[PDB]
A paper describes a structure:
To determine the molecular basis for [name] homooligomerization, we determined the crystal structure of the C-terminal half of [name] (aa 644–1017) at 2.4 Å resolution. The observed average value for inter-subunit buried surface area of the homotrimer is ∼1440 Å2,consistent with its high stability. N-terminal residues 644–674 were not visible in the crystal structure, suggesting that this region of [name](644–1017) is highly flexible. The trimer is arranged in a ring of two layers, composed of β-strands and α-helices, respectively. While Asp800 does not interact with an adjacent subunit, Trp799 is located at the interface of the two subunits and forms a hydrophobic patch with Ile771 and Val806. This hydrophobic patch interacts with Leu851 and Thr853 of an adjacent subunit.
The presence of the Histone regulator A ([name]) with the histone variant H3.3 in a soluble complex has implicated this histone chaperone in the specific deposition of this variant. [name] is in a complex that contains at least two other subunits, Calcineurin-binding protein 1 (CABIN1) and Ubinuclein 1 (UBN1). Furthermore, [name] serves as a scaffold protein to bring together the other subunits as well as ASF1a.
Numbering used by the authors:
A (entry chain A): 682 to 696, 700 to 871, 882 to 965, 974 to 1017
B (entry chain B): 675 to 871, 883 to 894, 900 to 964, 973 to 1016
C (entry chain C): 682 to 817, 821 to 871, 884 to 891, 899 to 964, 974 to 1011
Amino acid sequence: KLPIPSPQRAFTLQVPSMYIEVENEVTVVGGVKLSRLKCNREGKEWETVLTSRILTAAGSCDVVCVACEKRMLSVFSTCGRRLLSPILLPSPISTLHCTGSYVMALTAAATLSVWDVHRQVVVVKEESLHSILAGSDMTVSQILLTQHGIPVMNLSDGKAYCFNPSLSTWNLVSDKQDSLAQCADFRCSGPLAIIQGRTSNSGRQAARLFSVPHVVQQETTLAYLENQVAAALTLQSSHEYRHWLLVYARYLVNEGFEYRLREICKDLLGPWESTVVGLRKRELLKELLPVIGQNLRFQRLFTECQEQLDILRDK
Amino acid sequence: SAPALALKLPIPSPQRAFTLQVSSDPSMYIEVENEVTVVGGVKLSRLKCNREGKEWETVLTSRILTAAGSCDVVCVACEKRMLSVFSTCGRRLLSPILLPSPISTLHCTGSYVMALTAAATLSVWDVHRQVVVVKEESLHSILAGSDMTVSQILLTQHGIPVMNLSDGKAYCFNPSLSTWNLVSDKQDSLAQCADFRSGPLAIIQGRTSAARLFSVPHVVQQETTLAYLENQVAAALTLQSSHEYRHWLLVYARYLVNEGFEYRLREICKDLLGQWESTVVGLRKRELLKELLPVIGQNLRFQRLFTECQEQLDILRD
Amino acid sequence: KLPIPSPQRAFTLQVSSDPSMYIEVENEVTVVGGVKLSRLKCNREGKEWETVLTSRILTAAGSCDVVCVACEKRMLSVFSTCGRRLLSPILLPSPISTLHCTGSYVMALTAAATLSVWDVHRQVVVVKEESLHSILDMTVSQILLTQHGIPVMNLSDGKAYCFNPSLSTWNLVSDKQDSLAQCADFRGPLAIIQGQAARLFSVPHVVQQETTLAYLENQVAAALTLQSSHEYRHWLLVYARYLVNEGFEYRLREICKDLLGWESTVVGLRKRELLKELLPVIGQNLRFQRLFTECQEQL
């Protein structure tokens, strides 16, 4: 189970200062007991009434949402207009979280839902967290909801899983006890930085291992860098994806891994969806080409892309 | 550890024959005769369909338990948890669909087929587009705490299921949000105290056939009126009922203007005059905003906002 | 329920079949930092790539497009044909049992007999965690995986069910014991899954006509369910010729209306190129001259 917020006479909750006040069953109208939802944001205050008691609340710069007694979920605009019909959840609410126009409800049954209330679509449809934690005695130490409506569970053992909605999977994006980052020898703001944590302030070049042949450290470094690219992808973190894609590409250039390099260049050139995490794949290519060019070994690859880019410019 | 007892939806009994009036406007009768012959060891059941004196028929390889039909489709549910869907003139449209549990009831509206199973799951398919609309949603959430019944069941012309419960509550399933949504509630209705100036929502509510409050200050009646009208607008959107959405949005905007709800009507106008869909519920939003600006202009406090909206709108000569 | 592969020190598996594509796994070979590494190696034609993983590989699978591995702690990783990790490791809800890959389609069947299919090229799920308790009381047999990512399960009772991703359903596309094929009288993956009729002495001709109708309509719908495009063309036009020859006018007109115009394509073919191909079979019957005429609508 999960702790269910107990009924109260009234309460206040904070969240860019803005807060929520709730007063339950303050008045009666046509036989219907009313509960009040007040939102104090900057200078302006809005309010509204609901026909059942408010158990918990959450809000963002765009959205206020409220979990009420009869397993009901209501969502209101930045200025207090009801956005959606009340949502019946299959289990009593445990916690609510909002990020932008994304609303996340975690129920007492340990299931997790995420809606995009601006677009009026589900993002994460009732994902059990048993399916993650399994027979292991772990604990979801934290839970974050990104600006894309992507949930991330930081577990007690150092592993972080985030749900990919298009793949409909939980995906490992950090494992502090099996990280390859200290081994990784190659030439902060976003989500991936925050989840992994060692992104506090540590961009130090790593040392060559005295313990293993060079090829082992090369493969550890490859694997680490491809993990970072992949992870920024599943997290849909556009800026982090660009950063790691460029670092990885530089490493491929400097170590001479031609097949992986040509492969990503082909994928970024197309002949296919022209975008990844909302970036133009060919603009990403065009950003990599100078790095490719600084190594004479790839002069033809650099040239091929460049020429195939110019032909693309001439519609 | 299983419950000693768990209610289920009932499964139609095997019958040798039955007929069923499945059509109204184009009146349509369906006849079923089960296990009437054998070919190659395979026992066959017959399905017959009568529409306006024209008659088609076909055979199935298992007993037909129940059936439904519209102007567009006829579908049958059979033992071994199979569902088959046939065109208006009798052609099988899709492979037999394996249901997760035995059928209980079938409904059709246009090309939408809805199956409610013994396990109390609900499915809706658009057989014209051949896409699932509602994927095996448990009815447990809606039924827990009820009196074990559902008074009425609608499948709207956009394939949305609506459950009207005896306690006055109606829940519809929204396919995009993927939620059960409360779109009506006669007991907790704010409608009787709301003071302001054929569709699905109209049917679900008892409303197709207000006083000043003495006990509370005027602001409370305004807030109940606002909550009610927002509920109506949201309910119409959830039902994807376009005429009713436009109607309630227009009443709601008139109210916001009358009582001077500045920030709410600002928000609504910004949304209607725009990552932005030009459409809601199959309507051109800017057209609706144009249908507002009369009402908004009718008030002095919103002169600036009417001017700005007719401005950026008239900038559509470009 | 289903069996889990047991840990090994090393193993090899031929995966693809276009060239000899071999895969070699060496579990926990070296330690970088405190991290034990397992090696993944892939040989295809003359080319060898490799990479490391941080947990032990339990089984592998692959195709001309991808190699994927299932590891301990219920993890699933996917790599390009150059050894590049394509996706973050995927947490399976239950330990793996088997893996299949067809092109860029990856299918996991876990020990809890739940089945999943991902399109790793487009990065979308095809089949999201489908239990086989429902589709299975008989036991299972061969599991196929088509080139559009459709799962197909042949069961021990002769029935095959394939999972349509759009309808999100299990659909019956073959049933040997109840097959209407032996008695039907008319003159890709569906062939593979399924495997002149005498006239019947024991039933009236109308029963064999309806059985033949239902069989052909089943074949059309099964090809359309399997997304097998050439089999759909074939069976549509065999069925259409049965309709023409036997005089079933309303089914025929209906097919023409649909193919005329509304979605403009079917199973990746132009719905009007099909009307073009079956206008002449309509034309060889005098009774349907008007229909062959009424379809002369061009533009």
